[model samples]
Target: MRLKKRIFAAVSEGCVEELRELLQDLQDLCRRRRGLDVPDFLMHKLTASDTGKTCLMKALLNINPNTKEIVRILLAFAEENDILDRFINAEYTEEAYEGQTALNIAIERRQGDITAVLIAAGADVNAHAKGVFFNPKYQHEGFYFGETPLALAACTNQPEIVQLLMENEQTDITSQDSRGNNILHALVTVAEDFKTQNDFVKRMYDMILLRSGNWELETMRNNDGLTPLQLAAKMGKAEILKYILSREI
Candidate 1:
């Protein structure tokens, strides 16, 4: 248990060497004590029981010169131990970031390089971050990114990450969130009247449209029965709304 504490603390502080040592020490300790339940015990050591913040997630949130290497070491360790799937796809169980996997955090932090690594290492590109902190209705306390990883990447103006996600066959381009909003709908929801905000928002929207090659994206509706264009209009995002309307497709 103390090893678990040091493991997390070591990750947050970006103590790469300490983190590596703690990981090895904890794994060996688990193997010695739990033996047959090494997998379960490893999972326990890798994630915080209360917040579900795994070592990978902690490493991502606390970006440093060593974060990428830290993530690599963690992933390598997980792969070598045969727990790559569960470890890579692990999600936050706490309310604030519930359902958010390390992949989501990577993209959110604009770690394009790390994003590719996680995707290659089997991170769930389609996972949803359905926590209360993501709800738009919360206003000052919330940040809405349409729940899913692709939506988040798109909403945050991460064109490279968005393209990467779309290139993956398993990424559900049409996947909906709790509000039934798809990636396009999410783009509309996030658009602001400001020049800088609208620039990237419009660019992402256009890029997705051009590369998606999916005709039904613009017509898709959310829980409120509004298409992306309609949502843009309803939200009074005239620039983006006009951009959508201007499209002949």
Candidate 2:
């Protein structure tokens, strides 16, 4: 296996300290083996753990000041070595834990710095979580919970991230998950609490014309077979109910 693969295996096994030592030893070995200090690909693979967790994610979760500092230093090193792109695409898989790319974990944790770093390193802002949704054949791994990054961001109500992602122009707002729910539907579903019901209604009103043109609003249904308008009425969102009734049919 490649040296990076070896490093990934070591990290995945929880040998953090050993992986640290290898970082030092590998520097000299690479110089002798390939007349370089370390290969970009190896560094990229090293920065990203086998489970798709970035070193940044590990550092944030570990909550150790020294480890966090070490991760920062390594990230800088990876950037200088031009291997940050590979790190961004790295996947982390552990038993019982869903896999997430570095960007996904950063967003989930609300780590803006890590998110920015990964994005700067060429992480795909629209990168969907792998295996979260099942394919039609049910044989392929789908995105997380069958939602794309945009859908997740919308459901979480992170308007800043949603706006940031929209500004990036990388995310496909029209894309639907396995369940056929788009960003608008996900937003409506997530903002169902009493406090935000009005806000949700207004949002639906604002996007009605734009999204309705492309999507069959009347035909869209949740997994439970409730149309968007039916859901709004069931929830007693009067504003949404009125808007639906007044919308051009």
Candidate 3:
């Protein structure tokens, strides 16, 4: 019930205030102690799950300004604790229901600041959640969506987050998810029902390709085998088609 209590405290006391207090306490502990206790404390805190959720993971679920402050405090604490490597390197196994790193949670919530903080703290951009329940016949461990944080950001239509991820080199434009959904595919999915949105998504994709020099227009495909260009053409997006065709990729 401690996790539930912690969650309640976070909600009742405000995530930012609690996070700020936690960070200050951590800083004081680090200043006074001169051993591995900092990392030990961090590891203990990170591994202790309330209702199977770590504090870092819980922070990702809420996106209020309070949550934003919590994210900042946590990132700073992570840096001071010297436990960032553990965060970046930790892998979620099949038994873990959440199955996502803090970075993944941030992207899912479309928290650009948190995403940036994680990235700056050396969180793996390509760190992903993997499982096998989706494919009953082949229920084996595999990549979740082969997507990096940037891809998720794009899929959620958080262009600003996408831009931020790209700027930090935390996203791989060419990466695909378990479903074979690449960044372009994610963008397309977001634009599926809206023509105007589709155009905007395509423009962003084109810009990403140009900026990253990782565009593979001819080869990019979703799990269904539809190329980015083909999908655009099918959707009757002339501008997208034109842009894809004109791209150097």
lDDT of each residue in 180-212, candidate 3, tens digit only: 767776565445445556566666776777677
From the highest TM-score down, the ranking of the candidates is 1, 3, 2
Name model 2 segments beyond 4 Å from true.
1-26, 32-52, 63-72, 95-98, 130-146, 196-249
User: What's the TM for model 3?
Assistant: 0.67
Sorted on lDDT, highest at the top, how do the candidates line up?
1, 3, 2
Off by over 4 Å in 1: 132-141
Better of 1 and 2 by lDDT: 1
| Candidate 2 local lDDT, 1-249, one digit each (tens) | 366655545444445566666666655465555533465535544654444455555554543435434555556656666666665565556533454565665555555555665666677765655444211112123323335655555544455565566666565656655556556555545444355455644464355335335455455676667666776666676655566666656
Cα-based RMSD of candidate 2 = 7.5
lDDT of each: 0.81, 0.54, 0.60
Model 3: lowest-lDDT 10 consecutive positions = 132-141
Better of 2 and 3 by lDDT: 3
In candidate 3, the residue pairs with backbone N, CA or C atoms under 3 Å apart (3 or more residues apart, or in different chains) clash, namely 3-50, 145-177, 145-178, 146-176, 146-177, 146-178
Give the TM-score of each candidate. 0.91, 0.61, 0.67
